[PDB]
Ligand binder design. Structure first.
Ligand SMILES: CO[C@H]1O[C@H](CO)[C@@H](O)[C@H](O)[C@@H]1S[C@H]1O[C@H](CO)[C@@H](O)[C@H](O)[C@@H]1O
Ligand SMILES: [Ca+2]
Length: 455
């Protein structure tokens, strides 16, 4: 039976989806304020990202309609450059999850076609993949000013390629992504398990040495060490070792406490200088920590998970709209009249990102503490109050500090339906058998993939 809060999530989903159907059907993203759409893949991104969410929420007539579009309209031969990481976590991941939940081999067929078109990205001197690959022409290349790739981008594609190999029996996917993981396992230039942001595709070595963040460009490296370890049946001890090492590195080098509330937060390090800057992206970490504890990581990880969950909650509730901005700054020393969570004017956007509600889901699953459900409901009510578009859809906003003029940006990112509402639906569920942590691991875009239950 669905409960009150899950029904609320479904209502939000269906209001979002009626905008997508009316104004953006088959297109990458809804622009709900202007009742139009944008493309970058041209591959129905929001539709693919929401397949498994529709299935999970019981939206079966919508799922059927979307499946028909996948069957007749999804084609990968266009002359278009795609980012390998975004392609992998959203489209390859979303198709694999749709396959597993529905049992419909259409989704696997499409996944295999797509994965084969991404493989030219790995054709580099070091076998660290280029950032971009053209799925129609087979040409892959780095960005225009550099032969570096982003460390998170090359280390956050493994679940999907590993699973694709398992399902298809074609080893090329697994072999390509596992080479990357094994290579990075042996690289110099880490700080107590912390990785730099960039890696050169010619030399295979890290660049931008001495600069450490758990936010953009590095965050999901850590997430995918743990998740690959779980996926593989907990038999790949190097992944676990590198994860355990990295968490101690976080404790040693990046953790500080805010003023006035003494909240634990994760900052950035540049040539030994600490910076109290924290991307909302870093709020993945409490959930990943708690996930690890469920799977046997040390209790110290749970203490840190609970502290960071409170901080991420405050990053939301200390804003006038109750929604976290893209980037916050904390004060290490007392500042008269200031809250814990400071926000630069440029950073005040909210893009409907999932990381807080993602981590609330894990913290509730592992602890059973219903306050985490309450916190997620609070955030959802804030989404409804300040980002809802009457004709359909929800929009990113430019000013989380102005409840009267939040200033919509006219875009519904695919991860609102792929991630934010999925995690909220699961957070509110009365059923631990629903996508059990014993049976699935979620990829970087909330697409559940089966755990390889071991020998
Ligand atoms: C710019 O930040 C994004 O890209 C870098 C890699 O260039 C990642 O390190 C970072 O996690 C995010 S991707 C992240 O963003 C969305 C949620 O905010 C969503 O696509 C998904 O969760 C993805 O992991
Ligand atoms: Ca993510």
């Amino acid at each position: 039976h669905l409960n009150y809060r899950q029904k609320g999530v479904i209502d939000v989903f269906l209001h979002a989806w009626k905008g997508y159907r009316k104004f953006a059907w088959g297109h990458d993203e809804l622009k709900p304020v202007s009742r139009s759409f944008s493309e970058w893949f041209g591959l129905g991104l929001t539709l693919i990202d929401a397949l498994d969410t529709m299935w999970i929420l019981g939206l079966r007539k919508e799922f059927e309609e979307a499946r028909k579009w996948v069957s007749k309209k999804l084609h990968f031969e266009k002359d278009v450059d795609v980012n390998l990481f975004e392609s992998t976590i959203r489209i390859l991941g979303g198709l694999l999850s749709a396959y597993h939940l529905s049992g419909d081999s259409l989704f696997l067929r499409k996944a295999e076609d797509f994965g084969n078109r991404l493989m030219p990205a790995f054709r580099t001197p070091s076998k660290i993949p280029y950032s971009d690959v053209n799925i129609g022409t087979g040409v892959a290349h780095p960005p225009r000013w550099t032969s570096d790739s982003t460390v998170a981008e090359v280390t956050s594609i493994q679940l999907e390629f590993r699973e694709l190999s398992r399902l298809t029996g074609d080893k090329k996917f697994q072999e390509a992504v596992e080479k990357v993981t094994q290579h990075i396992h042996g690289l110099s230039g880490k700080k107590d398990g912390l990785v730099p942001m960039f890696i050169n595709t010619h030399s295979g070595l890290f660049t931008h040495l001495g600069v450490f963040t758990l936010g953009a460009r590095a965050d999901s490296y850590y997430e995918y060490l743990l998740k690959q370890w779980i996926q593989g049946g907990k038999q790949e001890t190097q992944l676990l070792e590198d994860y355990v090492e990295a968490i101690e590195g976080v404790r040693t080098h990046l953790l500080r406490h805010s003023e006035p509330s003494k909240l634990t937060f994760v900052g950035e390090l540049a040539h030994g200088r600490f910076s109290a800057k924290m991307d909302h992206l870093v709020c993945f970490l409490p959930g990943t920590l708690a996930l690890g504890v469920y799977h046997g990581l040390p209790a110290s990880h749970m203490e840190l998970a609970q502290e960071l969950m409170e901080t991420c909650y405050q990053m939301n509730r200390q804003m006038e709209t109750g929604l976290s901005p893209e980037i916050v700054h904390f004060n290490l020393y007392p500042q008269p009249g200031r809250r814990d969570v400071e926000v630069k004017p440029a950073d005040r956007h909210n893009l409907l990102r999932p990381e807080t509600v993602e981590s609330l889901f894990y913290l509730y699953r592992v602890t059973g503490d219903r306050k985490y459900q309450d916190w997620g409901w609070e955030i959802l009510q804030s989404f409804s109050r300040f980002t809802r578009v009457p004709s359909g859809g929800y929009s990113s906003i430019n000013n989380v500090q102005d409840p009267q003029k939040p200033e919509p940006r006219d875009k519904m990112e695919s991860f609102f339906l792929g991630e934010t509402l999925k995690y909220l639906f699961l957070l509110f569920s009365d059923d631990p058998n629903l996508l059990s942590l014993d049976a699935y691991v979620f990829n970087a875009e909330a697409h559940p993939l089966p755990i390889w239950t071991p020998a």
